[PDB]
Symmetry: C2
Subunit: 248 residues, 2 copies
């Protein structure tokens, strides 16, 4: 079972050109997304490859800024082969990285925020007008603007994932990978926009659960059932699973 | 992949006669042991069969009384075939059901507490002398005694799982299945007595996590790594996994 199978195989013609949103996530067997505050250490090479494979499938990546930060995200890269398969299929070489940030706090030493970064590598920042004012946020927005980063400010009322989802669709970006933030997974599930889930289950137990896989913002509860479509494991004993998310 | 494989296959001669303790558990993909307060509804027939298969492997079953209660446990039953395989191999027909109960609250309408229940079906109750006194507990202990149930009272200081573990070993009961209670799983892991884990991952998401798989008694934290030994799924998309628990 290859990563290409996991991402592309045993599917209908919905690939052909149908919009699709997928969430990709890693968890301990008991539902923690993090070990020592990060997800990376739980993953192995197979898992890292699968993320890249799904990125090769995606038109856009949606991720919470703090997850992007903690996971040392940089400008999106893809293997020479994938980018070429993409471009020949008339697709942009790289998916658009979309960062959800209510604070707008970013590390500007990152290449993601260099003023001369090629535009296709520049992240789309999605934020919200803060309800009660923050001069930090104002100053941060300005800094982003001054380096040339595109920032969409959602209204105070609105849902930032819905906004991102629309901004990306309105941009003809149809395949969306949500690489997380538990709270991002959570907002997406409860909006019902996740069609499939790639979940890696790492051979570890973490007590207490550092970071509940789908968030601890109990606010609005929900359950849902899944259809297992693909099941596999790495030689390090990580389980890779693809589920279809069942609506209503 | 059969349930008999999952339980018995790809192992060393440690089966031959080596003491072994295994925990068996079900979880949502995000680490809840319960849906609507119970585990049963998450399981399918394959999973129920696997529990029975592991019971056929076991000399004793250790389970928290409240889990036994919520899951409508009765006297242990095994298929005619398994019991015969057991007895011919010189084993007691049925494993000893061992119930961990600090309150000693039981439903005496259960056949488990009928005074004429055959002794091999009678549960071993493991409790603790309550630190500050409870006349309820006294009265309940007496009721159990009056129906003929064997009750071991651990000291106030001691660990009830350690006590159960010893009581069962001292009884020549070498293969122990812990069918749970998250807090029972938790106490067992932190005592380091779990050699292997059978974990079923059910195709559902439950937010908030109703019942953290390995307990929410944060008191003493821990992590551990696992070696995946067996991986399989049912036609309903439940994942069955067997891991070896790695000590120190």
């Amino acid at each position: 079972v290859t990563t290409e199978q996991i991402v592309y195989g045993a599917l209908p013609l919905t690939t052909i050109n149908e919009p699709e949103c997928r969430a990709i996530a890693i968890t301990s067997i008991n539902g923690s997304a993090t070990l020592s505050g990060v997800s990376g250490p739980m993953g192995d090479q197979t898992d890292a490859d699968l993320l890249i494979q799904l990125r090769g499938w995606a038109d856009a990546i949606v991720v919470g800024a703090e997850t992007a930060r903690k996971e040392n995200y940089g400008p999106v890269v893809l293997p020479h082969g994938i980018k070429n398969q993409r471009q020949k299929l008339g697709r942009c070489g790289l998916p658009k990285l979309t960062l959800l940030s209510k604070s707008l706090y970013f590390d500007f030493s990152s290449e993601l925020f260099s003023p001369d970064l090629p535009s296709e590598l520049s992240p789309l920042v999605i934020t919200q007008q803060p309800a009660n004012n923050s001069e930090q946020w104002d100053q941060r927005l300005q800094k982003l603007i001054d380096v040339g980063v595109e920032v969409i400010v959602a209204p105070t009322s609105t849902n930032p994932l819905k906004i991102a989802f629309d901004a990306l669709h309105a941009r003809r970006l149809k395949k969306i990978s949500i690489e997380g933030g538990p709270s991002v997974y959570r907002q997406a599930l409860s909006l019902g926009i996740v069609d499939r889930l790639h979940l890696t289950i790492a051979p570890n137990i973490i007590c207490p659960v550092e970071s509940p896989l789908f968030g601890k913002i109990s606010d609005d509860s929900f359950t849902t059932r899944l259809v297992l479509e693909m099941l596999s494991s790495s030689p390090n004993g990580l389980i890779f699973s693809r589920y279809k998310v069942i609506r209503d």
